[PDB]
Design a protein around this nucleic acid. Structure first.
Lengths: 184, 149, 100, 150, 305, 794
RNA sequence: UUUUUU
């Protein structure tokens, strides 16, 4: 929006690209949405689409491609799907050179053998950023029923430090053994 | 000439067989025209699968024709007359989300056929697909999403 | 829209809530380990579990987030709990094919 | 309202117009058909090769004056060329689903290598317009034999 | 491929009987958005669409019988109304009190229309004429004459210089305000007209007769640009959008259609009313539609630009 | 502004350019942009067949181009754009082109000039030549060649000459060949050369085929060249190969018009089944002339064949695709473009006749008459005269119709019958009878014989002579099969004479062996009228109730039952209200009459309700007044409703409302009656009742003076009629006896004498008895009341 | 027996 150019945010799920529309229209200015049936403001500078629409307007010209700067591929681990993984690669192949790419993902192992493919399919260098240690870590418990009136005991089998605890598993199994469809 | 010679409230029910994605069966309490249009559609699909398998492709005719799964023909046929949703809910055993989704995915295909019949040069299919679409979207099936407005 | 303002207290969601929406919550509780896909009756692969479990902690309103497994039928069979609860998520394949 | 009797008398004995004898039908008219396929011939015009572009003072650029120069990227169209120099499009148009329109170059592809250096302005090649006339359309087996014109 | 149209507000029971006319006026320079409606009562209620809803402001009344036409002005705060009562009393819209009262029977007025500069308030008579009164300046300086029948619809071109008039039996007459001379008479439909509208920039005149068709003429010649047939009963109003691309029509088959003049086709149909719909209008920068109906309700839609 | 022009959006670019021009006036690029925008607007106008708008736009574009050329007249693109503007008005129907060119363009700069078509095209050629002089490029050469081509085409097309335009065509070929040799790799130049080479004046088809093939080789994506080959082959009887060329052209561009029209023409030639649909598709894409005429021809041909109306061809295509209105709009555009072809006008008249647009049908036939004055075939001129005269007679102007039917040999049945009806309409019943007899002489198809006999009966009946009319209708009945029209006329003739003997026989005959009649309302009306003739007056309602029991649909029957209950036996007022409500509900277009009748029944009822709003008499009569403000009955009903509402409020004792409108309603009633054709007795009765009601209402509300002046004016109009004078007496004697007073026997005797004048009216007697009671002469009051009772019972 | 898009 600062440079006067245009940007396309593409999400695979039809229901995920509705609240994104709401949040991007509430946070700043004009945000159009395009889907199978919705067509709000096809003149804004932040069109939100499903990839099968960008794949359909790359095969023709559509004159929107003349103004792009960024294409933000949202969930790029849907390339692994069996009936829709070809859409992401028809898009990543047909994109012209003046359009920069942003690829959000979900912590895959071989991120450097994929960014290398896109780096030498185009002829631009691609920077790989990978993180760990999510905020507010999570302790994975296990709840087995006992003294159903008030008492609830939870056994810890994984903790905030990644260490597997066999003790919690054994305690849980033994409680289950001592205790040993809809009504339960 | 399969679709051209039917009523507009019958072409929608005939085309509902490409979209439902639901457990399927045939019907009994169906008119003759629909029960024969289903056979015509199945014959065209059989011809296409037969020219596919005779070339080198590996997709058996049965596997190609098994994507056609009717079973919302009667429900869509009753929906496109003025019948409210409650009676449809009673009619048959499919979850009421998987019905609104099928109707929404049919009113969006009976509108790309309005665009293709104008391209081929069929002005009677255009005038029937531009009717079968305007009679298909009236109520809570097409309620505007809260997020959008 | 009533879960993003805290006016609803318990959600009986399914995977459609795990993928199609964001709406972070406090405590995620599962109910089983195996979900059917295509005539297989497969158990949860590491990639799925991480997503649903991950939307457990909230942001600055609590120290941590607790993911509660709710084994009821038999023993949890920790051997498969090891490969499910920790494990390399998935490689990045390529499902290219020809369409008309 | 009027009474029944006069109502009937007006309905039937007012005039003979109501009879099927005087209706819009009951003539059996005919028309003759006259086609004209020469009207179908279409000739399109060439574009304007000039633009009257501005001038720029070589230092601290200011528009001295407007001078006409030759355009260079005409005869390029949206349905026969795939570059970001072609004319924009037909009009406000369907975003997707459009046959008869060309995508832009796919980014890993450049595909421009030619010089074709003649660059003449009086380049009249002395084409013969009556010596050996080619009479086979591209794709057919035979054309049509027209008599020579003396 | 069409846009996202839809309802925003629904007043449940505005009046006690049928609502026969509606006018939407963005009169003040600020954002006022006042809606005036008249019904089969004496009431001429004056609503205000403030932010997201209509709040009743005035319930002014002086009439004896049902109101057949109401009108609003774009320059001043003012309104006018006519009824079967043989009176054209014109209101104030600021303190909610009557300003004047003009005596005129079904032989002197049927339907109202202000001037572009809110000065003249022309009405259509029974004997064929168009009577032009004077607001704030008295009564009845002059009347244009067309040798015809009862006259139902009156329209003023936005730029001035044109006045159009439909009639029972179909004929349409176009006058020019500059000199008052009949330019040309169209033969149009074969059943009563009862609604007309010019387009902004005044080069396209849209009729709506009683047989179901919507002619689209072209002004400064007699060319017609097409017949729009998509309704199933009478057509009762046509309102033309602020940008010259669409217009809205309400019919007696309980349905509000939105057409576009480029391709002469119906983009979206509204199926929300339950009885005959007697009035449709746009607002300012046309992005919302008001529709008053035979069942006592006021619908406000959302037509994004 | 320039960027907005590039992307379409011409109006915004024009506004921006004008804002720039207001500040600075000599800015050449802004002027050039304005001219270019107007030229593009003109071309878009010519795509739809709007030929006046285009002329306006091009005139304005020339204005801007000369203004720009005044400052810098060394630049080439300005001259080329001027030539483009001048030559884009070809095929615009001359006598529509008058262009107000001014200034430098016509050499010296004198004032203004109005140019016609040939002059405009010549100026265009001059402009391209001048532009080319100072910058020699290929595009200008090709455009100059096309302009010369247009000039030669215009000269030939007005038949003004032939073989004296040879130099023009050779010049065009010279320019086009120069363009092609200057750059022989452009499909445009080869294609233009091909089109010109096959013009009727040159006729060199071998070069044309060579040029189209070269154009195709230069650029494979070429629909224009393929369609041009298709046209060339199709005109030289080569349907198959032309079909192939058209198929290639549409394969490359599915929305190109000429290829689709060519496919339709081929389908018509080989007699296929989808030719009508092909023409319809052509109409739907865009407006070409040839497709327009083809579609209209097929629509008219389908309407003629009367074995269609179950086919789903007629029903779906014609009546659900709105073929008739579409054909009408198409023919209007065609006729404005071409306007020297008669069959187009006659088809337009026919379609207008099916839309019941009679005035426009008369205009179409008139123009066809003008065209066809001189022609080798005279049959089409006589048929055109017959049709124009017939339509003229249909809507007034009987003298013109008679004159039109004069200018033809009256030797075919159609002309004689039309002449007879026009003569009857004007008057002249004897002449119409003679003509109908003359038509009877030459008759086949005995249905027509029966109809002519019925017309004879009607026409001589008008004069009188019911005996001969009756015998003539029996003679018609003696034919092999009756027509259901002679029987109805016989029943009406019987009813016109107050004797039910023959009417009953005719009705039984009609019922006996006639079922193919599908009105079902007219038979009920005749049966009820027969019963009313005998004065039965309760049987009538019973008969209509029987008819409604048989066919519970048919809104008309319910409406008629409500009307009859209002007129005969108004003691079932409540049932009548229900019947009117049912009729109104069961449709919408029966609203008018049904609401009127239910309101009158509600008036008769009284106030026998739950004092419920929104369904009282006043509301329903108002609803009816909004539906149809034309008949005088609705206004009279409104007056009655206002008076009744006042009395009901007085009984409830809350407030009188709706006080002073009687004079306006009376004016409305009289004005509305004035335009009703003829129900004379009914109109007179309605006006008399309305006058009396208005005077009484004014007296009651309290505006005595207005009642007095109204009555005096009515008496000043005509000599006295004993009804209105009683009204004047009543208005006179209201002030006195409102205050206690004794009246003198002279005035009282005068009033009594006036009352005897108009007897047979129970109201008057009751009012006089009230006067006697007021003074107090009780027994005299008793006697007057007794007279009213005796009169009422009789 | 989970999930989905032109």
């Amino acid at each position: 929006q600062k440079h006067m150019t245009r940007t396309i945010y593409t999400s695979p799920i039809k229901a995920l690209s509705n609240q994104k529309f709401r949040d991007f229209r509430n946070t700043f200015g004009d945000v159009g949405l395009l889907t199978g049936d919705v067509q709000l403001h096809p003149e804004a500078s932040c069109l939100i689409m499903t990839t099968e629409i960008l794949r359909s307007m790359l095969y023709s010209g559509s004159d929107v491609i003349r103004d792009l700067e960024w294409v933000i591929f949202d969930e790029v681990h849907y390339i692994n799907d069996v009936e829709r993984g070809v859409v992401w690669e028809e898009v990543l192949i047909m994109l012209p050179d003046h359009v920069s790419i942003i690829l959000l993902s979900a912590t895959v192992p071989n991120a450097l053998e994929f960014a290398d493919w896109i780096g030498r399919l185009k002829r631009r260098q691609i920077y790989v950023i990978s993180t760990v240690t999510r905020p507010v870590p999570l302790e994975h418990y296990l709840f087995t029923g006992n003294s159903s009136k008030t008492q609830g005991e939870l056994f810890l089998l994984l903790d905030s430090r990644g260490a597997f605890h066999t003790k919690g598993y054994y305690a849980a199994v033994e409680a289950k053994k001592e205790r040993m469809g809809p009504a339960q | 000439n399969a679709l051209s010679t039917l009523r507009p409230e019958e072409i929608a029910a005939l085309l509902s067989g490409l979209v439902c994605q639901s457990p399927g069966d045939a019907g009994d309490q169906l008119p003759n025209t629909l029960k024969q249009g289903i056979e015509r559609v199945r014959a065209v699909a059989k011809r296409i699968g037969e020219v596919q398998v005779a070339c080198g492709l590996n997709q058996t005719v049965e596997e190609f024709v098994g994507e056609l799964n009717f079973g919302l023909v009667e429900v869509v046929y009753e929906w496109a007359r003025g019948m409210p949703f409650s009676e449809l809910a009673g009619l048959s055993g499919t979850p009421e989300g998987l019905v609104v989704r099928c109707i929404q995915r049919l009113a969006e295909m009976c509108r790309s056929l309005r665009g293709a019949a104008r391209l081929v040069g069929e002005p009677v299919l255009g005038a029937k697909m531009e009717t079968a679409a305007t009679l298909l979207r009236r109520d809570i099936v097409f309620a505007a999403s809260l997020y959008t407005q | 829209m009533l879960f993003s303002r805290g006016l609803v207290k318990v959600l009986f969601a399914t995977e459609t809530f795990a993928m199609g929406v964001n709406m972070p919550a406090r405590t995620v509780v599962f109910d089983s380990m195996r979900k059917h896909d295509g005539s297989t009756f497969r158990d949860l692969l590491p990639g799925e579990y991480v997503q649903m479990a991950g939307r457990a902690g909230r942001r600055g309103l609590d120290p941590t987030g607790t993911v509660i497994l709710l084994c009821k039928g038999r023993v949890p069979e920790m051997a498969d709990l090891h490969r499910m609860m920790m494990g390399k998520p998935s490689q990045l394949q390529s499902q290219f094919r020809l369409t008309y | 309202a009027p009474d029944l009797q006069q109502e009937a008398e007006q309905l039937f004995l007012s005039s003979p117009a109501w009879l099927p004898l005087h209706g819009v039908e009951h003539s059996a008219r005919k028309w003759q058909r006259k086609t004209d396929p020469w009207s179908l011939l279409a000739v399109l015009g060439a574009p304007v090769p000039s633009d009257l572009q501005a001038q720029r003072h070589p230092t601290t650029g200011q528009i001295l004056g407007y001078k006409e120069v030759l355009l260079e990227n005409t005869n390029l169209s949206a349905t026969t060329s795939l570059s970001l120099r072609r004319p924009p499009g037909p009009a406000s148009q369907s975003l997707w689903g459009n046959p008869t329109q060309y995508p832009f170059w796919p980014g890993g592809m450049d595909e421009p290598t030619i010089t074709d250096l003649n660059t003449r302005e009086e380049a009249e090649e002395e084409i013969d317009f009556e010596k050996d006339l080619l009479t086979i359309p591209p794709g057919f087996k035979k054309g049509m034999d027209f008599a020579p014109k003396d | 491929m069409t846009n996202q149209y839809g309802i925003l507000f629904k007043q449940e029971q505005a009046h006690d009987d049928a609502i026969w006319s509606v006018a939407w006026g963005t009169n003040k320079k600020e954002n006022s958005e006042t809606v005036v409606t008249g019904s089969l009562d004496d009431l001429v209620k004056v609503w205000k669409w403030r932010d997201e809803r209509l709040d009743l402001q005035w319930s002014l009344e002086g009439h004896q019988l049902g109101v057949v036409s109401v009108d609003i002005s774009h320059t001043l705060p003012i309104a006018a109304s006519s009824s079967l009562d043989a009176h054209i009393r014109l209101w104030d819209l600021e303190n909610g009190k009557q300003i004047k009262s003009i005596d005129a029977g079904p032989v002197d007025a049927w339907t109202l229309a202000f001037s572009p500069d809110s000065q003249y308030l022309a009405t259509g008579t029974h004997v064929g004429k168009v009577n032009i009164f004077g607001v704030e300046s008295g009564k009845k300086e002059y009347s244009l004459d067309t040798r015809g029948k009862f006259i139902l619809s009156i329209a003023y071109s936005p730029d001035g210089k044109y006045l159009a008039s439909g009639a029972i039996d179909g004929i349409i007459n176009i006058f020019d305000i500059a000199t008052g001379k009949l330019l040309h008479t169209l033969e149009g439909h074969a059943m009563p007209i009862r609604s007309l509208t010019f387009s902004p920039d005044s080069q396209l005149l849209v009729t709506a007769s009683d047989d179901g068709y919507i002619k689209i003429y072209d002004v400064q010649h007699a060319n017609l640009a097409g017949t729009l047939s998509g309704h199933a009963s009478w057509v009762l109003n046509v309102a033309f959008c602020p940008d010259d691309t669409h217009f809205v029509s309400s019919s007696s088959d309980k349905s509000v259609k939105v057409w576009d003049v480029g391709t002469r086709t119906c983009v979206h149909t509204f199926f929300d009313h339950q009885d005959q719909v007697w009035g449709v209008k746009y607002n300012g920068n046309g992005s919302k539609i008001v529709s008053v109906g035979d069942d006592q309700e006021i619908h406000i839609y959302d037509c994004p630009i | 502004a320039a960027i907005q022009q590039i992307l379409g959006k011409y109006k915004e670019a024009v506004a921006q350019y004008q804002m720039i021009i207001k500040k600075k006036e000599d800015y050449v690029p802004a002027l050039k942009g304005l001219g270019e925008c107007h030229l593009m607007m003109a071309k878009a106008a010519l795509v739809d067949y709007l030929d006046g708008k285009a002329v306006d736009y091009i005139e304005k574009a020339l204005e801007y181009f000369t203004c720009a050329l005044q400052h810098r007249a060394d630049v080439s693109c300005l001259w080329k754009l001027a030539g483009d503007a001048c030559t884009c008005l070809y095929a615009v129907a001359p006598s529509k082109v008058n262009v107000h060119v001014l200034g430098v363009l016509l050499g010296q700069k004198e004032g203004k000039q109005v140019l016609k078509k040939n002059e405009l095209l010549h100026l265009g050629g001059r402009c391209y030549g001048r532009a080319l002089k100072l910058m020699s490029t290929s595009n200008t050469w090709c455009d100059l060649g096309i302009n010369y081509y247009r000039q030669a085409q215009h000269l030939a097309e007005t038949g003004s000459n032939m073989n004296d335009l040879k130099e023009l065509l050779e010049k065009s070929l010279h320019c086009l060949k120069k363009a092609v040799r200057l750059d022989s790799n452009n499909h445009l130049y080869w294609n233009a050369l091909g089109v010109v080479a096959c013009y009727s004046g040159i006729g060199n088809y071998a070069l044309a085929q060579h040029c189209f093939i070269k154009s195709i080789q230069s650029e494979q994506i070429n629909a224009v060249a393929w369609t041009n080959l298709g046209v060339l082959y199709l005109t030289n009887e080569n349907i198959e190969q032309a079909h192939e060329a058209f198929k290639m052209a549409q394969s490359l561009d599915p929305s190109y018009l000429m290829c689709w029209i060519g496919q339709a023409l081929i389908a018509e030639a080989v007699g296929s089944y989808d030719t009508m649909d092909l023409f319809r598709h052509t109409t739907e894409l865009n407006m070409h002339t040839e497709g327009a005429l083809g579609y209209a021809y097929w629509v008219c041909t389908t309407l003629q064949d009367k074995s269609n109306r179950e086919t789903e061809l007629y029903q779906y295509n014609i009546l659900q695709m709105n073929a008739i209105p579409a054909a009408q709009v198409i023919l209007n555009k065609y006729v404005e473009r071409i306007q020297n072809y008669a069959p187009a006008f006659t088809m337009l008249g026919y379609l207008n006749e099916h839309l019941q647009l009679k005035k426009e049908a008369a205009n179409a036939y008139q123009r066809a008459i003008l065209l066809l004055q001189t022609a080798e075939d005279q049959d089409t001129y006589n048929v055109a005269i017959r049709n124009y005269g017939r339509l003229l007679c249909s809507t007034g102007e009987y003298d013109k119709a008679i004159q039109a039917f004069k200018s033809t040999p009256l030797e075919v049945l159609e002309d004689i019958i039309g002449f007879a009806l026009a003569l009857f309409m004007k008057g002249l019943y004897k002449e119409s009878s003679k003509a109908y007899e003359r038509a009877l002489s030459i008759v086949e198809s005995e249905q027509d014989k029966a109809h002519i006999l019925t017309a004879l009966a009607i026409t001589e009946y008008k004069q009188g002579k019911t005996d001969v009319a009756k015998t003539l209708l029996f003679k018609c009945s003696i034919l092999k099969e009756p027509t259901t029209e002679s029987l109805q006329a016989l029943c009406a003739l019987g009813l016109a004479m107050q004797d039910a003997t023959l009417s009953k026989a005719a009705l039984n005959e009609l019922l006996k062996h006639i079922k193919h009649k599908d009105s079902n309302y007219q038979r009920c009306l005749l049966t009820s009228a027969i019963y009313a003739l005998q004065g039965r007056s309760v049987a009538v309602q019973k008969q209509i109730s029987k008819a409604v029991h048989s066919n519970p649909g048919d809104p008309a029957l319910w409406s008629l039952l409500s009307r009859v209950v209002a007129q005969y036996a108004q003691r079932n007022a409540k049932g009548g209200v229900v019947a009117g409500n049912v009729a109104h509900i069961l449709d919408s277009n029966h609203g008018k009459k049904a609401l009127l009748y239910t309101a009158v029944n509600q008036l008769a009822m009284g106030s026998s309700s739950a004092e419920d709003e929104k369904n009282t008499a006043l509301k329903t009569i108002q609803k009816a007044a909004l539906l149809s403000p034309g008949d005088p009955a609705i206004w009279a009903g409104l007056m009655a409703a206002c008076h009744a509402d006042d009395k009901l409020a007085l009984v409830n004792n809350t407030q009188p409302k709706r006080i002073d409108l009687y004079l306006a309603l009376l004016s409305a009633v009289s004005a509305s009656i004035k335009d009703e054709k003829f129900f004379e007795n009914y109109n007179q009765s309605l006006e008399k009742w309305s006058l009396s009601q208005a005077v009484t209402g004014l007296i009651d509300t309290g505006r005595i003076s207005e009642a007095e002046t109204l009555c005096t004016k009515n008496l000043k109009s005509n000599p006295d009629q004993p009804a209105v004078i009683l009204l004047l007496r009543q208005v006179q004697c209201k002030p006195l006896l409102e205050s206690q007073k004794p009246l003198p026997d002279a005035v009282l005797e005068e009033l009594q004498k006036t009352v005897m004048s108009n007897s047979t009216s129970v109201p008057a007697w009751q009012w006089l008895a009230h006067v006697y009671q007021s003074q107090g002469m009780m027994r005299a009051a008793e006697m007057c009341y007794r007279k009213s009772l005796q009169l009422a019972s009789q």
